[PDB]
Design an enzyme around this catalytic site. Structure first.
Site, PDB file in Angstrom:
ATOM      1  N   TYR A 166       0.876  -1.179   0.000  1.00 51.69           N
ATOM      2  CA  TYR A 166       0.000   0.000   0.000  1.00 51.69           C
ATOM      3  C   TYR A 166       0.914   1.230   0.000  1.00 51.69           C
ATOM      4  O   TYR A 166       1.973   1.214   0.634  1.00 51.69           O
ATOM      5  CB  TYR A 166      -0.955  -0.008   1.217  1.00 51.69           C
ATOM      6  N   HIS A 225      -1.486   1.133  -3.489  1.00 47.36           N
ATOM      7  CA  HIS A 225      -1.455   0.559  -4.828  1.00 47.36           C
ATOM      8  C   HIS A 225      -2.632   1.153  -5.607  1.00 47.36           C
ATOM      9  O   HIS A 225      -3.297   2.097  -5.146  1.00 47.36           O
ATOM     10  CB  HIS A 225      -1.452  -0.996  -4.874  1.00 47.36           C
ATOM     11  N   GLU A 257      -5.227   3.431  -3.528  1.00 46.23           N
ATOM     12  CA  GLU A 257      -5.875   3.167  -2.238  1.00 46.23           C
ATOM     13  C   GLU A 257      -4.838   3.032  -1.129  1.00 46.23           C
ATOM     14  O   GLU A 257      -3.646   2.781  -1.356  1.00 46.23           O
ATOM     15  CB  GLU A 257      -6.698   1.882  -2.235  1.00 46.23           C
ATOM     16  N   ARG A 281     -10.607   1.374   3.216  1.00 43.31           N
ATOM     17  CA  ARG A 281      -9.584   2.100   2.447  1.00 43.31           C
ATOM     18  C   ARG A 281     -10.034   3.526   2.150  1.00 43.31           C
ATOM     19  O   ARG A 281     -11.230   3.837   2.059  1.00 43.31           O
ATOM     20  CB  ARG A 281      -9.259   1.441   1.098  1.00 43.31           C
ATOM     21  N   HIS A 299     -14.651  -3.406   2.426  1.00 39.58           N
ATOM     22  CA  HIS A 299     -14.993  -4.758   1.937  1.00 39.58           C
ATOM     23  C   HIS A 299     -16.191  -5.257   2.762  1.00 39.58           C
ATOM     24  O   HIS A 299     -16.910  -6.190   2.380  1.00 39.58           O
ATOM     25  CB  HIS A 299     -13.822  -5.770   2.110  1.00 39.58           C
ATOM     26  N   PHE A 349     -16.105  -4.167  -3.111  1.00 39.18           N
ATOM     27  CA  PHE A 349     -16.102  -2.932  -2.336  1.00 39.18           C
ATOM     28  C   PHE A 349     -17.493  -2.300  -2.358  1.00 39.18           C
ATOM     29  O   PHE A 349     -18.212  -2.317  -3.373  1.00 39.18           O
ATOM     30  CB  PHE A 349     -15.058  -1.944  -2.840  1.00 39.18           C
TER      31      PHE A 349
HETATM   32  N1  LIG Z   1     -12.638  -4.898  -5.151  1.00 33.42           N
HETATM   33  C1  LIG Z   1     -11.621  -4.289  -5.771  1.00 33.42           C
HETATM   34  N2  LIG Z   1     -10.382  -4.627  -5.454  1.00 33.42           N
HETATM   35  C2  LIG Z   1      -9.474  -3.915  -6.154  1.00 33.42           C
HETATM   36  C3  LIG Z   1      -9.692  -2.958  -7.127  1.00 33.42           C
HETATM   37  N3  LIG Z   1      -8.489  -2.471  -7.628  1.00 33.42           N
HETATM   38  C4  LIG Z   1      -7.580  -3.139  -6.962  1.00 33.42           C
HETATM   39  N4  LIG Z   1      -8.103  -4.028  -6.042  1.00 33.42           N
HETATM   40  C5  LIG Z   1      -7.388  -4.957  -5.162  1.00 33.42           C
HETATM   41  O1  LIG Z   1      -7.434  -6.260  -5.711  1.00 33.42           O
HETATM   42  C6  LIG Z   1      -7.964  -7.185  -4.729  1.00 33.42           C
HETATM   43  C7  LIG Z   1      -8.784  -8.231  -5.440  1.00 33.42           C
HETATM   44  O2  LIG Z   1      -7.926  -9.279  -5.882  1.00 33.42           O
HETATM   45  C8  LIG Z   1      -8.765  -6.333  -3.771  1.00 33.42           C
HETATM   46  O3  LIG Z   1      -8.829  -6.959  -2.499  1.00 33.42           O
HETATM   47  C9  LIG Z   1      -7.959  -5.043  -3.744  1.00 33.42           C
HETATM   48  O4  LIG Z   1      -6.910  -5.104  -2.810  1.00 33.42           O
HETATM   49  P1  LIG Z   1      -7.043  -4.457  -1.354  1.00 33.42           P
HETATM   50  O5  LIG Z   1      -7.691  -5.513  -0.504  1.00 33.42           O
HETATM   51  O6  LIG Z   1      -5.629  -4.107  -0.926  1.00 33.42           O
HETATM   52  O7  LIG Z   1      -7.914  -3.236  -1.504  1.00 33.42           O
HETATM   53  C10 LIG Z   1     -11.009  -2.573  -7.422  1.00 33.42           C
HETATM   54  O8  LIG Z   1     -11.367  -1.740  -8.263  1.00 33.42           O
HETATM   55  N5  LIG Z   1     -11.941  -3.312  -6.686  1.00 33.42           N
END
Ligand SMILES: Nc1nc2c(ncn2[C@@H]2O[C@H](CO)[C@@H](O)[C@H]2OP(=O)(O)O)c(=O)[nH]1
Ligand SMILES: [Ca+2]
Length: 104
Positions: free
Chosen positions: A38, A40, A58, A77, A92, A100
């Site tokens: 993070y 990312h 995020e 986040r 989440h 999300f």
């Molecule tokens: N749900 C979601 N996850 C994202 C997105 N872009 C990156 N991610 C990351 O990719 C993971 C899914 O494989 C998510 O858990 C999230 O990591 P984070 O848990 O660190 O936020 C997005 O647009 N939506």
């Protein structure tokens, strides 16, 4: 009162602001933090209509009040952009799988 409510967590403007400042700072130096590196990119698969411009990044916001520096990132986040603007606050919690939902 809560400026942002992520399921169970109550976040105030000051909370959001602190995490966000930490993330844009790392992002600026080109440094990461944690096993998930993070901050990312937030892709926006959820398809939220942010009042701000892409691309997005995020960074975890903790219920604890402390800034993320490793360990469990929790479920919440803060989303900011290249201009250091607040896209929003997502979680989440109450979201299927790794999906999300936005904080109210
Ligand atoms: N749900 C979601 N996850 C994202 C997105 N872009 C990156 N991610 C990351 O990719 C993971 C899914 O494989 C998510 O858990 C999230 O990591 P984070 O848990 O660190 O936020 C997005 O647009 N939506
Ligand atoms: Ca707080």
């Amino acid at each position: 009162a809560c400026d942002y409510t992520c399921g169970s967590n109550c976040y105030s403007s000051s909370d959001v602001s602190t995490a966000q400042a930490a993330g844009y700072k790392l992002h600026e130096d080109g440094e990461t933090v944690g096993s998930n590196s993070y901050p990312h990119k937030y892709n926006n698969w959820e398809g939220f209509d942010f009042s701000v411009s892409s691309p997005y990044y995020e960074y975890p916001i903790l219920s604890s009040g402390d800034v993320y520096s490793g360990g469990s990132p929790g479920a919440d986040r803060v989303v900011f952009n290249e201009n250091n603007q607040l896209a929003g606050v997502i979680t989440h919690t109450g979201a299927s799988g790794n999906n999300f939902v936005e904080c109210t």
